């Protein structure tokens with residue numbers, strides 16, 4: 447169980463990272479984003495956290511752009527309320543790391559490459575997915591022209 451802290455309040459993890467309840471409470475995590483279609487929302491009935499499911503598959507066909515704004519408003523909410531947010535998908539964090547990078551691109555005005563450099567430096571293992579990479583590329587261009 448190794449929840450990588452990207453920002454003071456924003457943590458990246460995987461399938462098993464999201465089940466270490468004690469770890470989540472030590473870190474004052476109040477919000478969880480589960481970026482799968484099929485994994486359960488872990489610890490839902492213990493009513494301790496606010497959840498958001500981004501029902502996405504790890505393919506070269508899945509669109510994630512659609513989930514970006516939804517996910518940023520929920521990270522902003524964990525920040526405005528002084529709590530931490532965990533975002534996880536499965537092994538290799540393809541889906542969840544795509545979203546973290548997009549957040550760092552909009553709400554830190556980092557570049558694409560520089561966000562990836564930054565995340566991979568805190569979490570070494572990241573599966574490649576050129577579909578998501580290409581979608582981050584057009585997100586970067588929609589930001590530099592101000593369509594967001």
Ligand SMILES: CSc1scc2c1-c1nc(SCC(=O)C(C)(C)C)ncc1CC2
Nearest residue numbers: 540543544559562572573574575578579
């Ligand atoms: C924005 S990713 C990026 S930008 C420039 C490069 C890369 C890169 N990424 C990955 S893995 C991560 C992914 O595919 C994501 C799911 C996060 C989109 N492996 C190799 C490279 C080579 C150079």
